[PDB]
Amino acid sequence: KVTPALIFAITVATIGSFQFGYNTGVINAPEKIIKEFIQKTLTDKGNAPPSEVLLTSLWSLSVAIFSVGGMIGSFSVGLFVNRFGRRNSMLIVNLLAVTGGCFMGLCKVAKSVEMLILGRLVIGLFCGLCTGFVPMYIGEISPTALRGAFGTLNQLGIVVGILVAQIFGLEFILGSEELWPLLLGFTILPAILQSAALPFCPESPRFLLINRKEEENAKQILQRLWGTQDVSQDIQEMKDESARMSQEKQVTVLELFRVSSYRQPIIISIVLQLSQQLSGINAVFYYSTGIFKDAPIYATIGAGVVNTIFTVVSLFLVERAGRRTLHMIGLGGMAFCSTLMTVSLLLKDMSFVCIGAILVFVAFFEIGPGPIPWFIVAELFSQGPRPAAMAVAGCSNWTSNFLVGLLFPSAAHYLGAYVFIIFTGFLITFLAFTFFKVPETRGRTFEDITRAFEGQA
Numbered sequence: 001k002v003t004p005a006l007i008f009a010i011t012v013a014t015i016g017s018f019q020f021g022y023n024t025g026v027i028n029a030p031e032k033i034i035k036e037f038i039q040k041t042l043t044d045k046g047n048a049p050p051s052e053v054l055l056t057s058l059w060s061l062s063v064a065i066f067s068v069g070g071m072i073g074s075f076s077v078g079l080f081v082n083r084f085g086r087r088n089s090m091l092i093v094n095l096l097a098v099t100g101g102c103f104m105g106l107c108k109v110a111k112s113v114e115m116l117i118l119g120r121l122v123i124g125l126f127c128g129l130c131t132g133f134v135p136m137y138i139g140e141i142s143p144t145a146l147r148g149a150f151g152t153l154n155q156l157g158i159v160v161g162i163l164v165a166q167i168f169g170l171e172f173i174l175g176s177e178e179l180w181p182l183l184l185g186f187t188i189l190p191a192i193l194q195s196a197a198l199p200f201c202p203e204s205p206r207f208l209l210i211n212r213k214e215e216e217n218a219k220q221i222l223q224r225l226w227g228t229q230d231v232s233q234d235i236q237e238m239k240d241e242s243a244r245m246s247q248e249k250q251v252t253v254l255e256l257f258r259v260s261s262y263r264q265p266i267i268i269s270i271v272l273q274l275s276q277q278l279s280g281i282n283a284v285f286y287y288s289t290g291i292f293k294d295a296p297i298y299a300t301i302g303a304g305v306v307n308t309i310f311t312v313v314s315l316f317l318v319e320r321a322g323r324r325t326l327h328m329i330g331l332g333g334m335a336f337c338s339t340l341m342t343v344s345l346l347l348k349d350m351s352f353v354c355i356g357a358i359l360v361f362v363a364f365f366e367i368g369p370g371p372i373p374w375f376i377v378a379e380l381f382s383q384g385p386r387p388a389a390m391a392v393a394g395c396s397n398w399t400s401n402f403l404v405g406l407l408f409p410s411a412a413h414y415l416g417a418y419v420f421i422i423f424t425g426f427l428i429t430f431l432a433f434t435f436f437k438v439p440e441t442r443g444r445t446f447e448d449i450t451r452a453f454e455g456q457a
């Protein structure tokens with residue numbers, strides 16, 4: 001059963017997903033207004049005026065530093081989750097959200113570009129830690145038969161976060177010359193609501209029984225969250241996981257690549273992050289505004305509604321169809337839209353067909369490669385290696401996002417419309433990889449998933 005206790009716990013957790021989505025998508029709309037600020041602050045200092053190269057570098061640094069923070073943050077989740085707990089770690093890192101949000105919110109008043117760059121770094125550190133905390137907590141408090149459905153709420157949170165950031169970035173909302181510090185500082189508000197709500201959420205009963213050896217405390221939480229007495233099966237299941245973890249050495253990031261039974265789920269974990277970040281989703285949105293102009297922010301907001309609708313579609317299908325099926329349909333459908341893009345963009349100079357290709361690509365992305373890579377890593381591992389594995393998988397997601405972001409304008413300049421062909425090459429490669437290497441985890445236990453990798457190795 002799904003009690004209001006479970007819905008509340010997962011909703012409060014997904015505020016971190018929204019934070020990641022908001023901070024990712026917020027920085028694009030105030031570009032011209034923030035560049036003007038950087039230029040005014042630096043010129044008013046009294047020295048020689050800044051060069052266009054320096055001004056573009058500081059803008060690029062303001063954007064990119066968030067990815068650097070996220071890389072460090074996502075890779076650092078293991079320094080928190082076992083030490084403090086999953087619930088308590090989420091609470092502790094709101095101190096980074098508040099410091100990050102204050103730096104960005106006060107950089108204009110302080111007439112400081114240093115505060116803006118530090119603010120984006122610290123919010124990067126926070127979002128990075130979130131991207132690993134949220135799926136870990138959701139993956140451990142969710143009933144095994146709905147682990148994927150609740151897992152998809154991480155991506156729903158992210159997608160809604162981007163959308164709100166894009167809406168708020170409008171001139172008549174917070175995208176103004178006077179209100180842009182509030183636009184960046186907005187991240188403080190979900191952080192204060194999450195902080196006030198988190199002490200009312202339970203700690204992971206998997207964590208309490210396996211890591212903290214609190215069997216009764218875990219049983220009471222499980223009884224409340226699932227609103228039953230039949231928690232005896234799940235408790236014994238956690239006792240068999242606790243047994244395994246005490247028999248195995250403490251799992252370090254290096255051990256995941258050395259131990260054969262961890263090598264297969266970690267290659268799966270990393271490659272599924274690459275399948276999301278190298279799908280062509282960055283390219284589809286890059287060319288989006290240009291295509292809408294030929295036939296634009298209100299249309300970009302329109303792409304956000306499609307993005308939201310199809311994440312909800314995935315949520316209602318992932319427990320029926322399974323992860324393997326939805327990930328494959330997603331990659332396949334995107335490959336069909338990827339080739340249709342190349343033909344549309346070369347024959348455009350049919351913008352109506354290219355708008356359709358973008359809309360259907362987003363629809364396919366959100367069916368599988370969008371939500372699945374975020375929650376799948378928690379399913380492929382048991383308690384012992386889960387934090388280390390989510391540190392590696394999370395860092396892989398942030399690093400591949402960062403490297404695609406740096407190399408893509410250069411690739412789009414030299415290849416043009418033909419840039420969607422190398423994405424069709426990637427999509428088919430990940431479509432093949434999912435078919436032969438990714439096992440179905442739908443409705444299965446962490447112990448059943450682990451026993452299967454231990455049998456294969």
Ligand SMILES: CCCCCCC(CCCCCC)(CO[C@H]1O[C@@H](CO)[C@H](O)[C@@H](O)[C@@H]1O)CO[C@H]1O[C@@H](CO)[C@H](O)[C@@H](O)[C@@H]1O
Nearest residue numbers: 003004005006007008009192193195196197198200201202
């Ligand atoms: C826009 C909604 C604002 C209200 C906020 C809703 C809030 C939040 C408290 C924590 C966050 C603090 C910011 C209190 O809300 C309730 O609190 C009662 C107090 O007696 C009120 O009488 C009642 O009207 C109100 O809805 C709901 O709390 C509870 O929700 C349960 C699931 O449903 C949870 O199982 C439970 O662990 C939690 O504790």
Ligand SMILES: CCCCCCC(CCCCCC)(CO[C@H]1O[C@@H](CO)[C@H](O)[C@@H](O)[C@@H]1O)CO[C@H]1O[C@@H](CO)[C@H](O)[C@@H](O)[C@@H]1O
Nearest residue numbers: 068069072073074075076077078079096121122125126129
């Ligand atoms: C962006 C600028 C600040 C960077 C800070 C990086 C951070 C903490 C990250 C915490 C997350 C953010 C709140 C990584 O540090 C940790 O990183 C872990 C991997 O993630 C390692 O497993 C762990 O051994 C290491 O201490 C601390 O860095 C250094 O800390 C030194 C002792 O102040 C350590 O002697 C040194 O070694 C470490 O380099």
Ligand SMILES: CCCCCCC(CCCCCC)(CO[C@H]1O[C@@H](CO)[C@H](O)[C@@H](O)[C@@H]1O)CO[C@H]1O[C@@H](CO)[C@H](O)[C@@H](O)[C@@H]1O
Nearest residue numbers: 069076079089091092093094095096097118121122125126
């Ligand atoms: C949610 C609250 C988290 C607070 C974490 C504080 C933070 C990282 C700050 C990173 C953010 C700033 C960009 C302080 O570290 C800071 O220490 C300063 C002074 O030495 C340094 O100037 C600064 O560079 C460094 O990041 C912890 O880092 C390290 O502290 C060591 C202490 O023994 C720990 O052995 C080590 O495990 C830890 O990893």
Ligand SMILES: CCCCCCC(CCCCCC)(CO[C@H]1O[C@@H](CO)[C@H](O)[C@@H](O)[C@@H]1O)CO[C@H]1O[C@@H](CO)[C@H](O)[C@@H](O)[C@@H]1O
Nearest residue numbers: 098099100101102103106107109110111112113114115118
């Ligand atoms: C919410 C932020 C909390 C951190 C505080 C940081 C803050 C004050 C922020 C401005 C606040 C505007 C309402 C003081 O911070 C320092 O203050 C010194 C004493 O003044 C202390 O000795 C030192 O330990 C402390 O770090 C210094 O940061 C910035 O201040 C700018 C002044 O316009 C500077 O142009 C800028 O370049 C600097 O980067």
Ligand SMILES: CCCCCCC(CCCCCC)(CO[C@H]1O[C@@H](CO)[C@H](O)[C@@H](O)[C@@H]1O)CO[C@H]1O[C@@H](CO)[C@H](O)[C@@H](O)[C@@H]1O
Nearest residue numbers: 041042043045047048049050051054058112113114115117
């Ligand atoms: C209106 C003109 C302002 C120019 C300021 C340039 C800026 C800071 C960037 C400003 C924005 C801060 C958010 C570049 O600084 C960068 O320079 C890079 C290359 O050398 C370094 O790799 C990097 O670490 C450094 O931060 C500081 O560098 C200068 O600092 C002077 C002491 O204040 C030094 O006397 C001078 O000799 C140095 O040149």
Ligand SMILES: CC(C)CCC[C@@H](C)[C@H]1CC[C@H]2[C@@H]3CC=C4C[C@@H](OC(=O)CCC(=O)O)CC[C@]4(C)[C@H]3CC[C@]12C
Nearest residue numbers: 253254270274278392395396397398399400403404407
């Ligand atoms: C546009 C294209 C070129 C992007 C795809 C790049 C990938 C090949 C990169 C991006 C993310 C990378 C991963 C990011 C993080 C790590 C963890 C890293 O672990 C350590 O270095 C251990 C650190 C320690 O001592 O704790 C090993 C490599 C790995 C898996 C990286 C392998 C290579 C990946 C998949």
